[model samples]
Target: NSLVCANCEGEGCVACSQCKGGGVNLIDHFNGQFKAGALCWLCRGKKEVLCGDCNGAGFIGG
Candidate 1:
């Protein structure tokens, strides 16, 4: 599994710009709450990274 990155580092791509170096993902409520902050960008709101075996991809790629 990809390490938690002692230093959060984003790929700096269009889909992951806001995260910058935090390795986190921003969130928006589907209910249309403009100011509603959803999940934690770094840990996808789970506040934790994936296990060492999975590399945080959640599922092992077949």
Candidate 2:
């Protein structure tokens, strides 16, 4: 593993493409009703989530 290589738990890889590295944000959808914002669709606030190529750990090194 290279130093640049980060291991994301759920996504199995650091960084996601769904939100273009921003992850999912329904902020506008929730408006001001929710408190403390919401979690990202990927990584779940862990930051690094989703595989760059494999999409998830389930398909990694296979």
Candidate 3:
């Protein structure tokens, strides 16, 4: 038997923590100079991120 991942709830992924799942962040560098902060420090590329809690396995303590 395996335990479900509390972070992802067995789905193996979760919506990116930043920017409403777009994987981007808007930062205002200066007056009228807003820009994307960078790649998501969390999810990075995908809209969803693997369950770090489960190590991408969707489960824990199997």
Candidate 4:
């Protein structure tokens, strides 16, 4: 049995609200030091991470 997940709609992934689908954050150090960028802790550069609703199954209990 399979049930669609209301959160992901069976996609098993959802946009990272923090980054708003932008996984990486850029920070240019204006001190002439260098540039730094990092991926969203939640998304990790995926832009969309596994849905917590169905536990990344893309569906409910089966």
Candidate 5:
């Protein structure tokens, strides 16, 4: 009997939408000139992602 787990609604963990959380992702490439980025190896930057709708157990029907 609970609620608030509508996909991270409980805030267990979310925001790893391929670096959507701004963890990283730019690496344009071109060291010869100037352009690069990093820290976003599939959320490697710690953007977040463990919110499969209560999967994290932040909240749900007890």
Candidate 6:
């Protein structure tokens, strides 16, 4: 009695594992050379949106 999660269209939550989803914007060093990063607090950089385990409405039969 439920269906809509094509991958993340159920709105649950996915990606954004601290930049693993390419949210980027956490480059502590590009030319200055520091070699560190942060950001990516659940798409803080907006590289991607709504993808945290169906947070975008793409559930998987929960």
Best by TM-score: 4
Per-residue error for 61 in candidate 2, Å, reads 9.4
Candidate 3: pairs in clash: none
lDDT of 2 by residue, 1-62 (tens): 22222344444565544344554553544455433345665555555655665555434341
Tens digits of per-residue lDDT, candidate 5, 1-62, equal 88778778788888887667878765554444323356766677788878776877878896
Candidate 4 weakest lDDT stretch, 10 residues: 27-36
Task: Quantify all predictions' global Cα lDDT against the true fold.
Answer: 0.39, 0.48, 0.70, 0.73, 0.72, 0.59
Model 2 steric clash pairs: none
lDDT of 4 by residue, 1-62 (tens): 88899998998878876566877655544664433466655567788877888978888976
Compared with the true structure, the alpha-carbon lDDT of candidate 4 equals: 0.73
Count clashing residue pairs per candidate: 5, 0, 0, 0, 0, 19
Report the lDDT tens digits of candidate 6 across residue range 1-62: 56777765565565555576776645565456433455554577665676655556565554
Per-residue lDDT tens digits for candidate 3, residues 1-62, read 78888888888877876545887664544545445766655566577776678868888885
Clashing pairs in 1: 1-55, 2-55, 24-41, 24-42, 25-41
Ranking by TM-score: 4, 3, 5, 2, 6, 1
What value of lDDT does candidate 3 attain over all alpha carbons?
0.70
Runs in model 5 with CA error above 4 Å? 9-11, 18-23, 26-36, 40-44, 49-57, 60-62
Instruction: Please identify model 6 stretches exceeding 4 Å from their true place.
Output: 9-11, 21-36, 45-49, 52-55, 58-62
Candidate 3 minimal-lDDT segment of 10 residues: 26-35
Candidate 3 global TM-score: 0.59
- Evaluate residue 18 in candidate 6 and report its C-alpha lDDT on the 0 to 100 scale: 55
CA lDDT for candidate 5: 0.72
